[PDB]
Design an enzyme around this catalytic site. Structure first.
Site, PDB file in Angstrom:
ATOM      1  N   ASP A 181       0.949  -1.268  -0.082  1.00 35.19           N
ATOM      2  CA  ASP A 181       0.059  -0.023   0.017  1.00 35.19           C
ATOM      3  C   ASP A 181       0.821   1.249  -0.027  1.00 35.19           C
ATOM      4  O   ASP A 181       0.461   2.130  -0.682  1.00 35.19           O
ATOM      5  CB  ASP A 181      -1.063   0.064   0.987  1.00 35.19           C
ATOM      6  CG  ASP A 181      -2.340  -0.760   1.127  1.00 35.19           C
ATOM      7  OD1 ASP A 181      -2.565  -1.372   0.138  1.00 35.19           O
ATOM      8  OD2 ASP A 181      -3.324  -0.271   1.806  1.00 35.19           O
ATOM      9  N   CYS A 215      -2.598   0.731 -13.538  1.00 39.99           N
ATOM     10  CA  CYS A 215      -2.470   0.739 -12.154  1.00 39.99           C
ATOM     11  C   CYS A 215      -3.549   1.568 -11.626  1.00 39.99           C
ATOM     12  O   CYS A 215      -4.675   1.603 -12.434  1.00 39.99           O
ATOM     13  CB  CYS A 215      -1.236   1.228 -11.326  1.00 39.99           C
ATOM     14  SG  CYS A 215      -0.373   2.494 -12.421  1.00 39.99           S
ATOM     15  N   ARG A 221       3.423   2.513 -11.090  1.00 40.23           N
ATOM     16  CA  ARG A 221       3.861   1.250 -10.940  1.00 40.23           C
ATOM     17  C   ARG A 221       3.794   0.792 -12.490  1.00 40.23           C
ATOM     18  O   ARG A 221       4.777   0.064 -13.093  1.00 40.23           O
ATOM     19  CB  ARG A 221       2.652   0.270 -10.209  1.00 40.23           C
ATOM     20  CG  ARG A 221       2.755   0.752  -8.910  1.00 40.23           C
ATOM     21  CD  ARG A 221       1.632  -0.060  -8.239  1.00 40.23           C
ATOM     22  NE  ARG A 221       1.277   0.397  -6.879  1.00 40.23           N
ATOM     23  CZ  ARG A 221       0.343  -0.062  -6.007  1.00 40.23           C
ATOM     24  NH1 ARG A 221      -0.487  -0.862  -6.312  1.00 40.23           N
ATOM     25  NH2 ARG A 221       0.016   0.707  -4.760  1.00 40.23           N
ATOM     26  N   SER A 222       2.747   1.330 -13.338  1.00 40.20           N
ATOM     27  CA  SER A 222       2.750   1.042 -14.713  1.00 40.20           C
ATOM     28  C   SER A 222       4.127   1.402 -15.417  1.00 40.20           C
ATOM     29  O   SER A 222       4.474   0.740 -16.302  1.00 40.20           O
ATOM     30  CB  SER A 222       1.371   1.757 -15.512  1.00 40.20           C
ATOM     31  OG  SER A 222       0.396   1.298 -15.028  1.00 40.20           O
ATOM     32  N   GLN A 262       6.462   7.953 -10.317  1.00 43.30           N
ATOM     33  CA  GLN A 262       5.950   9.074  -9.593  1.00 43.30           C
ATOM     34  C   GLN A 262       6.757   9.506  -8.399  1.00 43.30           C
ATOM     35  O   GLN A 262       6.453  10.615  -7.939  1.00 43.30           O
ATOM     36  CB  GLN A 262       4.696   8.564  -9.069  1.00 43.30           C
ATOM     37  CG  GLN A 262       3.400   8.484 -10.029  1.00 43.30           C
ATOM     38  CD  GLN A 262       2.238   7.988  -9.476  1.00 43.30           C
ATOM     39  OE1 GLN A 262       2.108   6.903  -8.993  1.00 43.30           O
ATOM     40  NE2 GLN A 262       0.902   9.016  -9.412  1.00 43.30           N
TER      41      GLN A 262
END
Ligand SMILES: Cn1c2c(c3ccccc31)C[C@@H]1C[C@H]2[C@H](O)CN1
Length: 282
Positions: A181, A215, A221-222, A262
């Site tokens: 998370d 994502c 994440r992508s 990110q």
């Protein structure tokens, strides 16, 4: 510089935030006018994440052709990817219309439906064989065929039917279920094992349309997934694998979608994944 020793040099000097901010400063800025039209407000999950006009995927529809999705075309590596946000309640039919129209074999999902106690994307595929889904706005039917649950990821076989023509196709759903998370994984080993399973399925190969990867926003994440895949492919293709420059590859990908990677922690994790992956390949 090479990668593994540039890596230790950034760790010892603790300068990951400065490296990442340089990337943000040099990244491309292109218009995203279609994404910002008022009629498309409920088609975007986040107001600050939009596809560029020049690389956006168009739906084959004359009313409204807009979806928050981008084509990332890597010329030297000879790989293409579609990066998109997690589908919204009012875009699940558009999502599967895109999969159909672009002739994709595989969908790669890097988030859970709920994280941090909030919804990160719609439940857009069926959970039981006998309970299929019909998307009336785009005239598609989606059936769960089989499901294989493993410790770090799940693979599903799905049948997508175009109800207008009665044509059917098999879609593979690759779901990485264990990204934490908060932060990034401690080791890249399970993420790399997952990447290799997607590769082994044919879903990334030129005989199919581009893989669809998402994502929640379709940039963090992508971005890590396609950056690691492309860097490893270039290391196999070139005479000198130490010439592969992960920062240059990331800036090339950011010509096609804003914001890829990110955080500085995601940047460090991408280096780690490519470094460890290059040892297993040989
Ligand atoms: C193997 N397969 C097939 C379909 C299918 C749908 C879901 C999962 C697997 C599937 C539909 C038809 C026949 C065959 C073929 O591969 C494609 N067209």
């Amino acid at each position: 510089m090479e990668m593994e020793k540039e890596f230790e040099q950034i760790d010892k000097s603790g300068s990951w935030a400065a490296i990442y901010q340089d990337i943000r400063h040099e990244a491309s800025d292109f218009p995203s006018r279609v994404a910002k039209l008022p009629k498309n407000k409920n088609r975007n999950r986040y107001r600050d994440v939009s596809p560029f006009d020049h690389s956006r995927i168009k739906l084959h529809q004359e009313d409204n052709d807009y979806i928050n999705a981008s084509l990332i075309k890597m010329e030297e590596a000879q790989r293409s990817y579609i990066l998109t946000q997690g589908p919204l309640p009012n875009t699940v039919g558009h999502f599967w219309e895109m999969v159909w129209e672009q002739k994709s074999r595989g969908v790669v999902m890097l988030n859970r439906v709920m994280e941090k106690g909030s919804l990160k994307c719609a439940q857009y595929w069926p959970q039981k064989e006998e309970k299929e889904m019909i998307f009336e706005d785009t005239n598609l039917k989606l059936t769960l065929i089989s499901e294989d649950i493993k410790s770090y990821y799940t693979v599903r076989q799905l049948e997508l039917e175009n109800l207008t023509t009665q044509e059917t196709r098999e879609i593979l759903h690759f779901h990485y279920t264990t990204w934490p998370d908060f932060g990034v994984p401690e080791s890249p080993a399970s993420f790399l094992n997952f990447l290799f399973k997607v590769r082994e399925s044919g879903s990334l190969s030129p005989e199919h349309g581009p893989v669809v990867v998402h994502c929640s926003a379709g940039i963090g994440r992508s971005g890590t997934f396609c950056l690691a895949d492309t860097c490893l492919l270039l290391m196999d293709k070139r005479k000198d694998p130490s010439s592969v420059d992960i920062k240059k590859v990331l800036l090339e990908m950011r010509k096609f979608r804003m914001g890829l990677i990110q955080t500085a922690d995601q940047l460090r994790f991408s280096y780690l994944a490519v470094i460890e992956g290059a040892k297993f390949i040989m």
